[PDB]
């Protein structure tokens, strides 16, 4: 993607301020997929909820 | 066997050098008598 003589771009000023584009994620069907909808696409979905996973 | 297995271990320690960091905290005290005693040298004491 970068030509061989191009030095690797410094994250601190090329990428750090750029708003990220929208991911691939599917639009769930609201009235019907409701118990999954709140948390489905999070990184480690229910990590902060003792009722569903044990902890960090 | 204590003499040889120790020397064995020093050889065997070469075989795997990077499997983990060593762990080291035997922070020991030793008491010392400086031989060349004098009233001035140790600021007074016989020992350090």
């Amino acid at each position: 993607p970068f030509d061989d003589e191009e030095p690797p771009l410094d994250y601190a000023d090329n990428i750090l301020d750029v708003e990220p584009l929208e991911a691939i994620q599917l639009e769930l069907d609201p009235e019907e997929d409701a118990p999954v909808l709140d948390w489905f696409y999070d990184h480690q979905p229910l990590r902060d909820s003792r009722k569903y996973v044990n902890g960090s | 066997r204590v003499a040889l297995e120790k020397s064995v271990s020093q050889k065997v320690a070469a075989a795997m050098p990077v499997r983990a960091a060593d762990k080291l905290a035997p922070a020991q005290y030793i008491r010392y008598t400086p031989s060349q005693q004098g009233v001035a040298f140790n600021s007074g004491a016989k020992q350090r």
Partner: protein, 143 residues
């Protein structure tokens, strides 16, 4: 211009009245991250970073426990987004540790003998007036 939010949910109630100073502190960090190490020692160049990190964390800390200007929700929002340091706050709520620099300056493992730095020693106990600057941090005596 302001920092990318990692949360996507809307910010809490009192967000708009803490934004001039919080975004300006983030502008202050971006300067010191880029100033030249030329006229300064190897270890001295890292000192402004520990200082502004202290200042950001102190600012949220004062508005919640002292001035009571901020709810639980906005308080924990600023911690999550990286405006404050969760760990640094916990020492400030302890008895003696209340103007602490860094985690480094109390981390006993980061030293040979396994003790603190002279940073942490009370100024009345040194009795000789040796001006102090910490190599970890630059501090002249927290305690």
């Amino acid at each position: 211009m302001p920092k990318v939010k990692r949360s996507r949910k809307a910010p809490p109630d009192g967000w708009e009245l803490i934004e001039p100073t919080l975004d300006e502190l983030d502008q202050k960090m971006r300067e010191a991250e880029t100033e030249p190490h030329e006229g300064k020692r190897k270890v001295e160049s890292l000192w402004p970073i520990f200082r502004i990190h202290h200042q950001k964390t102190r600012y949220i800390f004062d508005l919640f426990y002292k001035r009571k200007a901020i709810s639980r929700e906005l308080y924990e929002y600023c911690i999550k987004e990286g405006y404050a340091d969760k760990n640094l706050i916990a020492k400030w709520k302890k008895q003696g540790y209340e103007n602490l620099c860094c985690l480094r300056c109390i981390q006993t493992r980061d030293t040979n003998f396994g003790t603190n730095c002279i940073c942490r020693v009370p100024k009345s106990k040194l009795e000789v007036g040796r001006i102090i600057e910490c190599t970890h941090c630059g501090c002249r005596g927290c305690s």
